[PDB]
Structure formats: structure tokens, C-alpha cells
Design a protein around this ligand. Structure first.
Ligand SMILES: [Cl-]
Ligand SMILES: [Mg+2]
Length: 225
């Protein structure tokens, strides 16, 4: 209740929060890896949600083959994963995301995007799907980071870009590595379990609140702190 008046900004992940894109991202990781000669299950792709493509790929190479991926393997796999993602009927808005962003903006809060994604098709569609909401100066993407989630790094960058202190922001995340990153950046973190995981893993990652959907979050927004 003290900390509600402090709030200046709401920091959203994109995949699994703004867009219902994760069934596609997991499918694509799995398929591109299969094609390369590596086993990456759809469930495990979900566990890597938040990491850079480069990080995801390297980790999977270590676990499966006992070696680093080369820069060329990384660029090739990542480019293919993107082609494959773009082959599916374009991902739609998560139900509740746009209603929530209207609530946030009417409360005078600044929306931000903090994503580990580099998917240009989705980043360019932010304006078309949530008009007037986001600005490129107030976003953090895969293009900005050296390490990425679950390194607090991208949310630390977001606080800096927004001229914010950790207590002036809230994080909305759906994936454990992202919840971790927000938490370790010292920001109050709301988890929304939009994926196929036990909500417990989101609490274990440091989430302050847990909601089952973006819609239910939106409904309870006004009763929070
Ligand atoms: Cl991506
Ligand atoms: Mg996400």
C-alpha cells in the first residue's frame, strides 16, 4: 500500500505475456534442433524461455554433445528458428494484455517491454497490437544485452532507461528465468502462469505474486498492494 504510490512503470515480458507466441517458439526450437541433429523437447524449450537465442543454443549444445556451439552454428540455428517461427499463422495478443495496458496507462504508469526475444516480426507488431503503449527508448530486447535472463541485466537496463529506481517499477513475467531476472534486479515481480508449467516454479524463482492468466491479473489489478 506504501509501495503502490511509489509505482511509476510496469515492465512487461513480450512472449507469453503480451503475445501468445510461446507454443510457436517451443515448437520452433524443437524442430530446428531436431534438424540440426539435437534433442530439445518442447517442454525444455519452455524452460529456456527468457534466454538469448545464443545462450539457449550454447546450453543445449553442452548438455547434448559436451561441447560449445560455434558462432556459425549459433547464427544458422537462430536464423532458422526465426524462419520457422515466422511460418506459423501470426501470433495473437494474450487475452487480457491489452485491457491491462489500458488500466496501467490510465493510472499514469509507463509501460515498458523487457524481452529476451530478438524476433523482429513480433517487435514490429507491438505498435499495431498495443497502440500508443510502448516506445523503443523504453524497451529492452535481445539486441541490448550481453548476457540476458536470468541475469538481472536486462531489467537493470530497463530501470536505467526509464530513469527508475527498483521500487518505482513492477515486473510482469511468465517464465522462471525471467521471474528470476526481475527478482534479482530487486523489482517487485508478478508471475502470470500462461504456459504449461507448475506455478510453483515461478514462486520458487522469486515471484511476489502469482496469477494463472493475464485476464485474472487484469481483474485483480486494482486490488494489488
Ligand atoms: Cl527470439
Ligand atoms: Mg515470457
Amino acid at each position: 500500500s506504501h509501495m503502490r504510490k511509489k509505482l511509476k512503470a510496469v515492465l512487461f515480458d513480450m512472449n507469453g505475456v503480451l503475445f501468445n507466441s510461446m507454443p510457436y517458439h517451443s515448437e520452433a526450437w524443437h524442430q530446428v534442433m531436431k534438424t540440426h541433429g539435437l534433442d530439445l523437447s518442447r517442454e525444455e524449450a519452455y524452460m529456456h524461455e527468457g534466454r538469448t537465442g545464443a545462450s539457449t543454443i550454447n546450453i543445449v549444445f553442452q548438455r547434448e554433445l559436451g561441447k560449445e556451439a560455434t558462432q556459425e552454428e549459433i547464427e544458422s540455428i537462430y536464423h532458422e528458428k526465426s524462419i520457422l517461427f515466422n511460418s506459423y499463422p501470426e501470433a495473437e495478443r494474450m487475452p487480457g494484455a491489452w485491457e491491462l495496458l489500458q488500466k496501467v496507462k490510465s493510472e499514469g504508469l509507463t509501460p515498458m517491454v523487457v524481452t529476451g526475444s530478438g524476433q523482429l516480426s513480433l517487435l514490429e507488431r507491438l505498435e499495431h497490437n498495443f497502440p500508443g503503449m510502448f516506445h523503443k527508448e523504453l524497451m529492452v530486447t535481445a539486441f541490448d544485452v550481453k548476457y540476458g535472463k536470468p541475469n538481472p541485466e536486462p531489467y537493470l537496463m530497463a530501470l536505467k532507461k526509464g530513469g527508475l529506481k527498483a521500487d518505482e517499477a513492477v515486473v510482469i513475467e511468465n517464465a522462471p528465468l525471467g521471474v528470476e531476472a526481475g527478482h534479482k534486479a530487486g523489482i517487485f515481480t508478478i508471475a502470470v502462469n500462461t504456459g504449461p508449467l507448475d506455478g510453483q516454479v515461478l514462486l520458487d524463482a522469486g515471484a511476489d505474486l502469482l496469477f494463472p492468466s493475464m485476464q485474472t491479473l487484469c481483474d485483480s489489478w486494482d486490488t494489488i498492494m
